[PDB]
Amino acid sequence: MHGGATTVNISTAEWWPKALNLDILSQHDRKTNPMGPDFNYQEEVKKLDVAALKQDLQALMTDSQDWWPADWGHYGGLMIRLTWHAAGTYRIADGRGGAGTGNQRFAPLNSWPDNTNLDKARRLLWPIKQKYGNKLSWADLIAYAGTIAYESMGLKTFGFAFGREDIWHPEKDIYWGPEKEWVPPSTNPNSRYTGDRELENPLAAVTMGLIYVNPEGVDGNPDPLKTAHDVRVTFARMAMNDEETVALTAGGHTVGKCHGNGNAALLGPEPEGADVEDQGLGWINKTQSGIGRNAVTSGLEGAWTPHPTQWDNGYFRMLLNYDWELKKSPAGAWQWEPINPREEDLPVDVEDPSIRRNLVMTDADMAMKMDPEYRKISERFYQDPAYFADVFARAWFKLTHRDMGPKARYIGPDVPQEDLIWQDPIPAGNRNYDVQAVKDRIAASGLSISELVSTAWDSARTYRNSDKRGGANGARIRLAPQKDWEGNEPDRLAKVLAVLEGIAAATGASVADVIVLAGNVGVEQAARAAGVEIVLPFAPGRGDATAEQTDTESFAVLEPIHDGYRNWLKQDYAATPEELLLDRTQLLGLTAPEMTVLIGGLRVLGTNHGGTKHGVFTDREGVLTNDFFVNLTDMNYLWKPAGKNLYEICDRKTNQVKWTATRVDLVFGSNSILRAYSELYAQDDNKEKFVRDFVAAWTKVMNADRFDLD
Amino acid sequence: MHGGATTVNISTAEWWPKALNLDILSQHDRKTNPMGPDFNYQEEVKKLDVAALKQDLQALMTDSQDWWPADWGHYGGLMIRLTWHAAGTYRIADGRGGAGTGNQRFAPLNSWPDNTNLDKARRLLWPIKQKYGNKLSWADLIAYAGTIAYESMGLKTFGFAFGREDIWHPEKDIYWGPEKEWVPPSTNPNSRYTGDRELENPLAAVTMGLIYVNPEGVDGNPDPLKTAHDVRVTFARMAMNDEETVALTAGGHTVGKCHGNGNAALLGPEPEGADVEDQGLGWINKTQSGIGRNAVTSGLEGAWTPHPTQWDNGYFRMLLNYDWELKKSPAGAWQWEPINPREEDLPVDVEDPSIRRNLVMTDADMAMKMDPEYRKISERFYQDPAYFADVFARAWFKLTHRDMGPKARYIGPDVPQEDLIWQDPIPAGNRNYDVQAVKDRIAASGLSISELVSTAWDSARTYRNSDKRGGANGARIRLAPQKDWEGNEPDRLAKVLAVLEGIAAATGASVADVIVLAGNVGVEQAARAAGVEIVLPFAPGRGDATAEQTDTESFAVLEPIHDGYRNWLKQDYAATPEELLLDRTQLLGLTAPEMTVLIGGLRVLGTNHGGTKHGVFTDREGVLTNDFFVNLTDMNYLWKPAGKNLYEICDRKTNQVKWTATRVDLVFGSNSILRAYSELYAQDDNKEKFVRDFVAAWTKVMNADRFDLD
Ligand code: HEM
Ligand code: HEM
Ligand SMILES: NNC(=O)c1ccncc1
Ligand SMILES: NNC(=O)c1ccncc1
Ligand SMILES: NNC(=O)c1ccncc1
Ligand SMILES: NNC(=O)c1ccncc1
Numbered sequence A, B: 001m002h003g004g005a006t007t008v009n010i011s012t013a014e015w016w017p018k019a020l021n022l023d024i025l026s027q028h029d030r031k032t033n034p035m036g037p038d039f040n041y042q043e044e045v046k047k048l049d050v051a052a053l054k055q056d057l058q059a060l061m062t063d064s065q066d067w068w069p070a071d072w073g074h075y076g077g078l079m080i081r082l083t084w085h086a087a088g089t090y091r092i093a094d095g096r097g098g099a100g101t102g103n104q105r106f107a108p109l110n111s112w113p114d115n116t117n118l119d120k121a122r123r124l125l126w127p128i129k130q131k132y133g134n135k136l137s138w139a140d141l142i143a144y145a146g147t148i149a150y151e152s153m154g155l156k157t158f159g160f161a162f163g164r165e166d167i168w169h170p171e172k173d174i175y176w177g178p179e180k181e182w183v184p185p186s187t188n189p190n191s192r193y194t195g196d197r198e199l200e201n202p203l204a205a206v207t208m209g210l211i212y213v214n215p216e217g218v219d220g221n222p223d224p225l226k227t228a229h230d231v232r233v234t235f236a237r238m239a240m241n242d243e244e245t246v247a248l249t250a251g252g253h254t255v256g257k258c259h260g261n262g263n264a265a266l267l268g269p270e271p272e273g274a275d276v277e278d279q280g281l282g283w284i285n286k287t288q289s290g291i292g293r294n295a296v297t298s299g300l301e302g303a304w305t306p307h308p309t310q311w312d313n314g315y316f317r318m319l320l321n322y323d324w325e326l327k328k329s330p331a332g333a334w335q336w337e338p339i340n341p342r343e344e345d346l347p348v349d350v351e352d353p354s355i356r357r358n359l360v361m362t363d364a365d366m367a368m369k370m371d372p373e374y375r376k377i378s379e380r381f382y383q384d385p386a387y388f389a390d391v392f393a394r395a396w397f398k399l400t401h402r403d404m405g406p407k408a409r410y411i412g413p414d415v416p417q418e419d420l421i422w423q424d425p426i427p428a429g430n431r432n433y434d435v436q437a438v439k440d441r442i443a444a445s446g447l448s449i450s451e452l453v454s455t456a457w458d459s460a461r462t463y464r465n466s467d468k469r470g471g472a473n474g475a476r477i478r479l480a481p482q483k484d485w486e487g488n489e490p491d492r493l494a495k496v497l498a499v500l501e502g503i504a505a506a507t508g509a510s511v512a513d514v515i516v517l518a519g520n521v522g523v524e525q526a527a528r529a530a531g532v533e534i535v536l537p538f539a540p541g542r543g544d545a546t547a548e549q550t551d552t553e554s555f556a557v558l559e560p561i562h563d564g565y566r567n568w569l570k571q572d573y574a575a576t577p578e579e580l581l582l583d584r585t586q587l588l589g590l591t592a593p594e595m596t597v598l599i600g601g602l603r604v605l606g607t608n609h610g611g612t613k614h615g616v617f618t619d620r621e622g623v624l625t626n627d628f629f630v631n632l633t634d635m636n637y638l639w640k641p642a643g644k645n646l647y648e649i650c651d652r653k654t655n656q657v658k659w660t661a662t663r664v665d666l667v668f669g670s671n672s673i674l675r676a677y678s679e680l681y682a683q684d685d686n687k688e689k690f691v692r693d694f695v696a697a698w699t700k701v702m703n704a705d706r707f708d709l710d
């Protein structure tokens, strides 16, 4: 027998399941990235022959492959379902999920029950990926496929942007929910539901391994009105309102079908569970024909429209004009079928068009008819189909781009020139100003180091790499709702902004550029106070966004209700402060060593929310030294718990309290990885490395949102 | 609630526990390494003030700290136990474990029950680490501490080498055993024992969380003769024979004591389980005094010698001259105490020397008296103490250096000039020869590409980064036992060596240098055959080792009984072929993208063991192309299992068998990470990237053991 920890279960994880998952900070690194260190996907994708790609992708739609034949000779429905599921994992609370990384090709998502047979759809796109190569990411390809499908089936799509860079392993940072089985009912142990069927907060799906809701009803029990409530809830958590939700649902089901003509128990394991002979595919039926008319996917069986290969007004025509009742598909799934349909409305067999099959609606489709608010939108869409096609095209674009970040990241010839509000638009800022002059005015203000640093931190800290929202570009901190957020210390913030707005007015640098420049100046002073002279790198050009281009409600999810870096917690939460710091740090894109130096430096700069002294382990606040680490690692002190999220650092000999500290401070001296970092920075020889690393991490955070730069 | 996978249990690991643990290949990367990319510990440690360090470390031995006072005012015993436990995790079967990485400061090892209170010992060394900084790794410091302790307590140690570079997280590649509890009896479910109490093979300890054996007896039942069997077995798996084993045991227990004066149930959680207030420490007693005379560590209580602060002949004097019986320590542990000791032989209280305490022996100590083979060595050591001190000093040096690799890695002023056989010595090879001339002779031989490449691969593939043994330096492939290993294809190997020995003789390049140069030539030709002209980088200087300096039995553990890279398996094993490939790849130091290109390239070069065609998915064998990937990713084929570790690749349309393949081949098309890599290399635009990456990986492997270079 061999001594390799060679399968995934063998681990430290079993022994101390509560430990911080620091691995989420060291993802997507060089040893996993198979590309050269100078590869730049954005510059490559700019060279892609898009017109040629569009042509090949359109041709693929009607180029049936015999190992997974196209329904009616057209892969369009499959491809739209692929792209909808790719995008459909997004959620607004943390920005995680979405189509922006091509994550559907990796675990767990490649093997979710809701993604059954999308393994074949991905595989069908391989010859195109093979052809266009490094200039076409799987992520962009997967995001594009359904858009091209809509074009080929007769819908005028609103546009498309390239620019999604591929990843090479699962996104380990994404918590998909608490369950340890696929699609368990909402009364299971480990439920994602609390209280009065309230869906726990980051989550945007009703159960583990579904995209949004259960097509058969809540917990598998048909009831259109309860299904509607779940639809409304899950879709809102994916940034969509009633109109967008009805449009998306109807528009999706205007094409394609449900596959459930066989026995679902005969499908082989999902892809991560299948053995090598299945070619990275899953759900393979080796007992009977599992393809064409015998395909089984969701278990429901039928098409929503008479002509599932084309964009039309079939969906509301069927739904609204027929009356419907519950039936069981051949695989045993609940579905709705129409009472007394006409022959001529029956969709035909996917292999032989001389045979007629059946129409179907899911519980979510029936919701669009029975929920009184959806019913109104549905009737509008049936009576005004041009409006329907417009709203649908726009919502489909939003769906597939909502995690792409600012328009500065978008590439390609079909990028819409409109600025949509959900792109959080920001104009280009003037770059032709004297930086030094601005710095001199900042220094000559009487704003302290702590005011300066806290304000620039608070402006940048909202950035999240999950969907590329937030950050210092735009100076949205000066606008509603940010300017009144409790974590942002609105009085201190109003005080600093009054000054810095004056400076911006006077110099023609944006308020955004000045906020950042000012934090640089506070850091610079703090270093100078330690006898270190440095100038921090600085890139001008940030714009100031307007209130008109700032969706107030959509910014709610970026509010800092916790920020370990300023020892801030708005309330007492169930998660530990240090887990919350890890989460925020992962969204900022920071590594564990970065996280560590930032904490130590921010602490000694005197930047804690409320001017608290927790973790301020220095006799010289305002001076950028490694004191935090020196003192944290000093065994002349013992640490005594002193209530909620608080500790006394006491002298072992005198039994006097020297400092206080929170769990955010003390984890850097407790966790064995973080203390190893703390010890490195507390070494006699690493005072200058500490400053230099602090600076580099500061700068990283100030520039996180600068996609406008090249 | 927040959407971060923020604690270690949240994972893909739960869902598909059988999946390959590819993370073990992407360890110790840039995002975890807090040092600058140009930091080089070897060049820094060369600048360390060793004499000053020796002085500080010696002073620490008698610089008692009040939070964990030194027994009798001397930390020596604690520090030797620290260093022995650090080194004592080594095992020969895979080279994993040992003191060579400073792993004791990270999970799981920092919290093993056998490492109780070594958290305090590590902490006590922090002020020295803080002082010497980046020029002194925690790894070297921990390895050195016990050596300096022995010096200060009167023993002439044999020497010491610096050069162990620190790591920054647990070694995820090390499988420590199957149990999910600490120290369970050998009849538990999940036992590491098979058959007739046969210890499963990589493992070198009798249970989970112990270093070697149970000090209270087998499964906690005292019986010196059964304890002896476990001692003999575990120590042999750590490279030590009877003489070294008795010397180590006696020499360790010549100093220090067992701590068990209290109740073990009152000790707080081990370090990874303790909360933030414990300062990364563990086992803290908050209910009563847990320090000094009230310390509890193993639960046994007493010292082996009258004078535990000094090197002497107390150990065999006590053991051999007193008769012993079983008693229970105050913590409730079984131990041996002497019948009728004299007052004057009783070790005194650790805080107050006017109080006498007790002598003790463990079951392993009694083994040294009762096992008939140990008894003889013990009497030799008692009658010849100079011999004892010599053997012990040498074995202690071996213990602490056995995973350091060749002497070329050793640094510092106390490196022994002797070449010990366990360092696998190799001389410097002549570097002043004409490389091209050698290449021309190789090319003009009639040795094929496959002979050339296979032979260089087989010479290098034995390298393992766990203990830095093996590799192409030394040309030990031409010697016993390697030249007759079945995986090395001894006839083909004898045929190639006859030629290449001739070339080496003729040119004054070592046989080692020529073996590698020859593989480069085979690769070069193969590329030329594809119309690509490259010259592979090459570093001369390898030596040819002698039989006299090659310990035949110790090389047994490097035999290639499996090597996916040449589609080789010596027998049918319980582990899957792909898990075995992952293990080997991790020991070679390769990343997953490296592993991937190496497989594809080796396959098309025609290098499989036995000249098999499994995975040879080309019509042009001998030509270095990306054909393997092109064909592997082609859905014109289906894959049919065809017995053990074998598959047929069949044309979907004709149902004819086109190629055959093993699991090692097909996992690269099945695993979702590996197929993502396979697809990258099968892209129309990546023929040259494939060759270039192949070459870079080839070169990496050929140079893995070249510590002689700078
Ligand atoms: C609102 C909740 C939704 C539910 C419960 C739902 C449910 C389903 C189900 C059960 C299938 C059948 C899958 C199969 O068996 O092959 C399916 C197919 C599909 N859905 Fe949805 N859907 C929803 C929303 C959407 C949206 C928002 C889109 C796109 C805008 C979409 C587009 C599609 C398409 C194109 C197919 C056809 C697949 C094919 O022809 O292969 N659906 N839907
Ligand atoms: C052969 C099996 C061995 C067993 C079962 C064993 C067992 C133990 C036990 C139970 C303790 C007491 C720990 C405590 O309660 O503080 C201990 C202490 C120690 N052992 Fe071993 N030991 C073994 C081999 C070794 C070796 C090979 C070395 C070094 C060459 C060593 C050196 C020490 C030292 C120095 C201490 C004293 C710790 C102190 O004074 O704080 N032992 N041993
Ligand atoms: N063999 N296939 C059928 O008879 C069938 C197809 C679709 N819905 C119901 C039945
Ligand atoms: N259920 N059948 C399939 O998923 C399949 C059929 C043929 N080749 C690959 C996959
Ligand atoms: N319980 N429902 C499912 O397992 C399922 C749902 C949608 N597609 C496939 C399977
Ligand atoms: N309080 N400590 C004792 O009485 C003791 C110390 C060591 N062995 C036995 C007893």
Ligand SMILES: NNC(=O)c1ccncc1
Residues within 6 Å of the ligand: B067, B068, B281, B282, B283, B284, B285, B286, B289, B290, B291
């Ligand atoms: N059992 N007691 C201890 O481990 C300890 C005592 C004082 N400070 C730190 C640790």
Ligand SMILES: NNC(=O)c1ccncc1
Residues within 6 Å of the ligand: B113, B114, B115, B116, B183, B297, B298, B299
């Ligand atoms: N069962 N034995 C133990 O748990 C143990 C052994 C050695 N040191 C501490 C604890």
Ligand code: NA
Residues within 6 Å of the ligand: A030, A031, A032, A033, A034, A035, B593
């Ligand atoms: Na790389």
Ligand code: NA
Residues within 6 Å of the ligand: A090, A095, A096, A097, A098, A100, A403, A465, A466, A467
């Ligand atoms: Na996202």
Ligand code: NA
Residues within 6 Å of the ligand: A254, A255, A305, A306, A307, A308, A309, A310, A311, A312, A314
């Ligand atoms: Na239609």
Ligand code: NA
Residues within 6 Å of the ligand: A685, A686, A687, A688, A689, B134
């Ligand atoms: Na330094």
Ligand code: NA
Residues within 6 Å of the ligand: A593, B030, B031, B032, B033, B034, B035
């Ligand atoms: Na780094």
Ligand code: NA
Residues within 6 Å of the ligand: B090, B095, B096, B097, B098, B100, B403, B465, B466, B467
């Ligand atoms: Na090792």
Ligand code: NA
Residues within 6 Å of the ligand: B254, B255, B305, B306, B307, B308, B309, B310, B311, B312, B314
């Ligand atoms: Na002694």
Ligand code: NA
Residues within 6 Å of the ligand: A134, B685, B686, B687, B688, B689
């Ligand atoms: Na290329």
